[PDB]
Amino acid sequence: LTEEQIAEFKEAFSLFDKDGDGTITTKELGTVMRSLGQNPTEAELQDMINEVDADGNGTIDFPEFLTMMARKMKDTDSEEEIREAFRVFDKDGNGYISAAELRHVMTNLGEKLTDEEVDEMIREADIDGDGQVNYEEFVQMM
Template sequence: MIKAKEDTTQALYKEAFNLFDKDKDGKITIQELGIVMRSVGSNPTQQELKDIAKEIDDGSGLVDFNKFSSLMTRKMKYSDSEADIKQAFKVFDKKGNGYANIQDLKHTLTSIGEKLTKEEFDNMLKDAKTVDGQIHVDEFVRVIKSSKSFN
């Protein structure tokens, strides 16, 4: 089942890539990368596109399908993880307003499952933007994704 999903996803990537590979040389331009990514369901910001270009451009200004496919596979895995984090966050969002109590999060993350130490939790949130002892879901996702244990 997973293999079939991967094959379908790869076929979708290939089809989108080929639409922009006008001269059929197996490459698209860095400038076209964002358009192709959006056509397969990703929505990178301009800054993300700049970062991606720095990472994958070998100086030619072109991206081959293998680099594109690898990038998209990694990005979609990351997006799935973000969705999982947001889904888990909902348990703590008692008012349904996108905010959770930091002490509730701390208690749970330091006492259930793969426990963090209180120090690890405090370090993870030390640079987080909080409001009245609350953290917004997007800020929580950012903090979790940037933590060493997530990567």
């Protein structure tokens, strides 16, 4: 949405477009991915291309890249904001939000709850039944 921003996304695109022809092919996406220790199959690479390839011509060009890369940024943004929230709630940072941790954090906001009420909250979120709220469950609740 800004000329600086459009240029930033160009540079990102340039790493994928290895031969500089304005398109990213499956192989070029394959070359890049295998530079990052991911070894995806030929059909996995076609799927990733198809997802972004809006006009179905088989490759991704800069406009299509731009569109994808913004959404990825707008999704990775919020996912970090949900992790940091989860971390403020997960007091001992072990990966699971407990009744005591929820009660304790809610209290320091102001919302002083009972053990019954905090159990109900945890139950309302505890999809996997482990008696605690993990990240997956935390994100669905929000």
